[PDB]
Design a protein around this ligand. Sequence first.
Ligand SMILES: CNc1nccc(CN(CC2CCNCC2)S(=O)(=O)c2ccc(S(=O)(=O)N(Cc3ccc(Cl)cc3)C3CCCC3)cc2)n1
Length: 149
Amino acid sequence: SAKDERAREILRGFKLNWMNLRDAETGKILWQGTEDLSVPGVEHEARVPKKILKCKAVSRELNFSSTEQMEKFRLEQKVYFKGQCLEEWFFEFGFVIPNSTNTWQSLIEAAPESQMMPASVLTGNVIIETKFFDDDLLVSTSRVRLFYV
Ligand SMILES: CNc1nccc(CN(CC2CCNCC2)S(=O)(=O)c2ccc(S(=O)(=O)N(Cc3ccc(Cl)cc3)C3CCCC3)cc2)n1
């Protein structure tokens, strides 16, 4: 379909350039990287400080480029622990100018009344599954395994 083709065109023109995570309360940088963790078809890995689990809220900056125009660029993310979804997050960027580079800031807030498992239990057992969309059009699905260090 035309939609299938457009999804592949968007992915072809997309790159995640850099990303970081901060403690939202204190502003302290917890993690940064310049690897495109959204590339599909390989299992990515990331090592995050275990103190992230004690943060009430984490702020993320995600810098991306896109050759293609999008009307409603958005993400869905699922936190999987040993194959079970523990949390689902939704974030919207909106309109993307063709051939633009953009920094997208999002807030990841603790769900009540969730409590974090110990880092030692979680480490290597958490997969983040991320789906990019333009509106209802699925552009890519990618996975990252987390280690708490
Ligand atoms: C019961 N729920 C539960 N249990 C364990 C872990 C978490 C998820 N954690 C975040 C919260 C923060 C608020 N309260 C404490 C935990 S997390 O620290 O493991 C986490 C997970 C994913 C992300 S992410 O989606 O921003 N991101 C994954 C990611 C981001 C963007 C894209 Cl395109 C792809 C992957 C990466 C983390 C390492 C590199 C960046 C941030 C933080 N949730």
